[PDB]
Design a protein around this nucleic acid. Sequence first.
DNA 1: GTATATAAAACGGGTGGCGTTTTATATAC
Length: 180
Amino acid sequence: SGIVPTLQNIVATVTLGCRLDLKTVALHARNAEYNPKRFAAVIMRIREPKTTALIFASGKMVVTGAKSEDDSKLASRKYARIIQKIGFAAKFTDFKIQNIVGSCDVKFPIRLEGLAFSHGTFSSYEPELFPGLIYRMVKPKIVLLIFVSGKIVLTGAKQREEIYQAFEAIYPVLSEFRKM
DNA sequence: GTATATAAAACGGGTGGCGTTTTATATAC
Protein backbone atom coordinates (compact mmCIF):
# COMPACT_ATOMS: atom_id res chain seq x y z
CA SER A 1 0.00 0.00 0.00
CA GLY A 2 1.39 3.42 0.96
CA ILE A 3 -1.34 5.23 -0.95
CA VAL A 4 -3.55 7.70 0.90
CA PRO A 5 -6.49 9.36 -0.95
CA THR A 6 -6.29 13.01 -2.05
CA LEU A 7 -9.24 15.28 -1.24
CA GLN A 8 -10.69 16.87 -4.40
CA ASN A 9 -13.86 18.76 -3.47
CA ILE A 10 -15.60 19.85 -0.25
CA VAL A 11 -19.26 21.03 -0.21
CA ALA A 12 -20.59 23.04 2.75
CA THR A 13 -23.67 24.89 3.96
CA VAL A 14 -23.90 28.18 5.89
CA THR A 15 -26.87 30.08 7.32
CA LEU A 16 -26.52 33.86 6.93
CA GLY A 17 -29.62 34.45 9.05
CA CYS A 18 -31.25 37.21 7.05
CA ARG A 19 -33.16 37.63 3.81
CA LEU A 20 -31.25 38.87 0.79
CA ASP A 21 -32.08 40.96 -2.27
CA LEU A 22 -30.40 38.96 -5.00
CA LYS A 23 -30.30 41.70 -7.62
CA THR A 24 -28.54 43.89 -5.05
CA VAL A 25 -26.14 41.12 -4.11
CA ALA A 26 -25.31 40.30 -7.75
CA LEU A 27 -24.96 43.97 -8.57
CA HIS A 28 -22.58 44.78 -5.74
CA ALA A 29 -20.41 41.69 -5.68
CA ARG A 30 -17.15 41.81 -7.70
CA ASN A 31 -17.58 38.28 -9.10
CA ALA A 32 -21.26 37.42 -9.34
CA GLU A 33 -23.72 35.87 -11.85
CA TYR A 34 -27.49 35.98 -11.50
CA ASN A 35 -30.10 34.90 -14.03
CA PRO A 36 -33.44 34.29 -12.13
CA LYS A 37 -34.79 32.46 -15.21
CA ARG A 38 -32.09 29.75 -15.04
CA PHE A 39 -31.45 29.22 -11.30
CA ALA A 40 -32.73 30.97 -8.19
CA ALA A 41 -29.40 31.95 -6.62
CA VAL A 42 -26.52 34.32 -7.13
CA ILE A 43 -23.45 32.39 -8.18
CA MET A 44 -20.64 34.26 -6.45
CA ARG A 45 -16.90 33.45 -6.58
CA ILE A 46 -13.70 34.43 -4.76
CA ARG A 47 -10.11 33.86 -5.79
CA GLU A 48 -8.65 32.71 -2.51
CA PRO A 49 -9.46 30.03 -1.59
CA LYS A 50 -10.76 29.35 -5.12
CA THR A 51 -14.41 28.44 -4.54
CA THR A 52 -17.96 29.07 -5.77
CA ALA A 53 -20.98 29.97 -3.60
CA LEU A 54 -24.69 29.56 -4.37
CA ILE A 55 -26.46 32.37 -2.50
CA PHE A 56 -30.21 32.22 -1.89
CA ALA A 57 -32.86 34.83 -0.97
CA SER A 58 -33.58 32.97 2.30
CA GLY A 59 -30.04 33.78 3.32
CA LYS A 60 -28.90 30.16 3.06
CA MET A 61 -25.69 29.57 1.16
CA VAL A 62 -23.96 26.54 -0.37
CA VAL A 63 -20.14 26.77 -0.73
CA THR A 64 -18.32 24.32 -3.02
CA GLY A 65 -14.99 23.73 -4.77
CA ALA A 66 -12.63 23.74 -1.80
CA LYS A 67 -9.88 21.08 -1.50
CA SER A 68 -9.60 21.19 2.29
CA GLU A 69 -11.92 21.64 5.29
CA ASP A 70 -9.85 24.69 6.32
CA ASP A 71 -10.28 26.25 2.92
CA SER A 72 -14.01 25.58 3.07
CA LYS A 73 -14.57 27.42 6.39
CA LEU A 74 -12.18 30.20 5.30
CA ALA A 75 -13.92 30.83 1.99
CA SER A 76 -17.32 30.61 3.74
CA ARG A 77 -16.40 33.31 6.27
CA LYS A 78 -15.18 35.40 3.31
CA TYR A 79 -18.46 35.11 1.43
CA ALA A 80 -20.32 36.09 4.59
CA ARG A 81 -18.14 39.22 4.98
CA ILE A 82 -18.96 40.22 1.35
CA ILE A 83 -22.68 39.99 2.10
CA GLN A 84 -22.12 42.17 5.23
CA LYS A 85 -20.08 44.68 3.24
CA ILE A 86 -22.93 44.95 0.75
CA GLY A 87 -25.12 45.90 3.71
CA PHE A 88 -27.20 43.02 5.01
CA ALA A 89 -27.46 41.93 8.66
CA ALA A 90 -25.78 38.59 7.90
CA LYS A 91 -24.12 36.33 10.45
CA PHE A 92 -21.70 33.45 9.87
CA THR A 93 -23.55 30.50 11.39
CA ASP A 94 -24.16 26.81 11.10
CA PHE A 95 -21.10 26.01 9.03
CA LYS A 96 -21.32 22.30 8.17
CA ILE A 97 -19.50 20.14 5.62
CA GLN A 98 -22.08 17.99 3.76
CA ASN A 99 -19.93 16.13 1.23
CA ILE A 100 -16.23 15.29 0.76
CA VAL A 101 -14.84 13.75 -2.45
CA GLY A 102 -11.47 11.99 -2.63
CA SER A 103 -9.44 10.11 -5.22
CA CYS A 104 -6.32 7.99 -5.69
CA ASP A 105 -4.45 5.57 -7.94
CA VAL A 106 -3.58 1.98 -6.94
CA LYS A 107 -1.21 1.64 -9.89
CA PHE A 108 -2.60 -1.63 -11.33
CA PRO A 109 -5.57 -2.57 -13.59
CA ILE A 110 -8.70 -4.06 -12.03
CA ARG A 111 -11.07 -6.85 -13.15
CA LEU A 112 -14.41 -5.07 -12.71
CA GLU A 113 -16.59 -7.95 -13.86
CA GLY A 114 -14.99 -10.34 -11.35
CA LEU A 115 -15.35 -7.80 -8.55
CA ALA A 116 -18.99 -7.14 -9.49
CA PHE A 117 -19.72 -10.89 -9.42
CA SER A 118 -17.91 -11.38 -6.09
CA HIS A 119 -19.26 -8.28 -4.37
CA GLY A 120 -22.60 -8.33 -6.11
CA THR A 121 -24.79 -6.92 -3.35
CA PHE A 122 -22.67 -3.77 -2.98
CA SER A 123 -21.71 -3.45 -6.64
CA SER A 124 -23.35 -2.05 -9.72
CA TYR A 125 -21.56 -2.35 -13.04
CA GLU A 126 -23.05 -1.57 -16.45
CA PRO A 127 -19.98 -0.66 -18.67
CA GLU A 128 -22.20 0.35 -21.56
CA LEU A 129 -23.99 2.87 -19.33
CA PHE A 130 -20.98 4.11 -17.37
CA PRO A 131 -17.45 2.52 -17.46
CA GLY A 132 -16.84 2.50 -13.69
CA LEU A 133 -18.08 0.11 -11.03
CA ILE A 134 -20.27 1.74 -8.33
CA TYR A 135 -19.48 0.22 -4.96
CA ARG A 136 -21.79 1.06 -2.06
CA MET A 137 -19.90 0.40 1.18
CA VAL A 138 -21.86 -0.33 4.37
CA LYS A 139 -19.35 0.79 7.06
CA PRO A 140 -18.40 3.50 6.49
CA LYS A 141 -21.33 4.46 4.24
CA ILE A 142 -19.27 5.67 1.28
CA VAL A 143 -19.75 5.30 -2.47
CA LEU A 144 -16.70 4.35 -4.56
CA LEU A 145 -16.33 4.56 -8.35
CA ILE A 146 -13.81 1.92 -9.43
CA PHE A 147 -12.16 2.00 -12.85
CA VAL A 148 -10.26 -0.58 -14.95
CA SER A 149 -7.23 1.72 -14.88
CA GLY A 150 -6.93 1.51 -11.12
CA LYS A 151 -8.09 5.10 -10.50
CA ILE A 152 -10.53 5.27 -7.53
CA VAL A 153 -13.14 7.91 -6.55
CA LEU A 154 -14.63 8.00 -3.00
CA THR A 155 -17.60 10.23 -2.13
CA GLY A 156 -20.50 10.74 0.31
CA ALA A 157 -18.25 11.42 3.33
CA LYS A 158 -19.05 13.90 6.14
CA GLN A 159 -15.59 13.46 7.71
CA ARG A 160 -12.12 12.91 6.20
CA GLU A 161 -11.56 9.66 8.18
CA GLU A 162 -14.45 8.01 6.33
CA ILE A 163 -12.64 8.57 2.99
CA TYR A 164 -9.50 7.08 4.54
CA GLN A 165 -11.47 4.23 6.18
CA ALA A 166 -13.19 3.17 2.98
CA PHE A 167 -9.98 3.04 0.93
CA GLU A 168 -8.25 0.94 3.62
CA ALA A 169 -11.24 -1.37 3.48
CA ILE A 170 -11.37 -1.56 -0.33
CA TYR A 171 -7.60 -1.99 -1.03
CA PRO A 172 -7.45 -5.77 -0.27
CA VAL A 173 -10.41 -6.28 -2.61
CA LEU A 174 -8.86 -4.26 -5.42
CA SER A 175 -5.69 -6.37 -4.97
CA GLU A 176 -7.63 -9.62 -5.20
CA PHE A 177 -8.99 -8.44 -8.57
CA ARG A 178 -5.85 -7.04 -10.18
CA LYS A 179 -4.76 -7.79 -13.78
CA MET A 180 -0.94 -7.40 -13.42
C1' DG B 1 -24.39 13.55 -22.59
C1' DT B 2 -23.78 8.97 -19.27
C1' DA B 3 -22.86 8.09 -13.05
C1' DT B 4 -21.65 9.36 -7.70
C1' DA B 5 -22.30 12.16 -3.32
C1' DT B 6 -24.57 16.85 -1.35
C1' DA B 7 -27.06 21.21 0.18
C1' DA B 8 -29.81 25.15 -1.14
C1' DA B 9 -35.27 26.09 -3.01
C1' DA B 10 -37.91 28.07 -7.20
C1' DC B 11 -40.10 26.27 -11.13
C1' DG B 12 -43.43 23.65 -13.82
C1' DG B 13 -47.84 22.49 -13.73
C1' DG B 14 -52.48 23.03 -13.71
C1' DT B 15 -53.99 24.13 -7.86
C1' DG B 16 -50.27 19.22 -6.26
C1' DG B 17 -46.54 15.77 -4.98
C1' DC B 18 -42.38 15.89 -6.69
C1' DG B 19 -38.90 15.71 -10.54
C1' DT B 20 -35.67 18.94 -12.55
C1' DT B 21 -32.23 22.16 -12.12
C1' DT B 22 -27.21 24.28 -10.62
C1' DT B 23 -22.42 24.15 -8.58
C1' DA B 24 -17.77 21.79 -7.69
C1' DT B 25 -14.67 17.44 -8.35
C1' DA B 26 -12.21 13.07 -9.35
C1' DT B 27 -12.98 9.30 -13.01
C1' DA B 28 -13.73 7.23 -18.26
C1' DC B 29 -16.92 5.90 -21.86
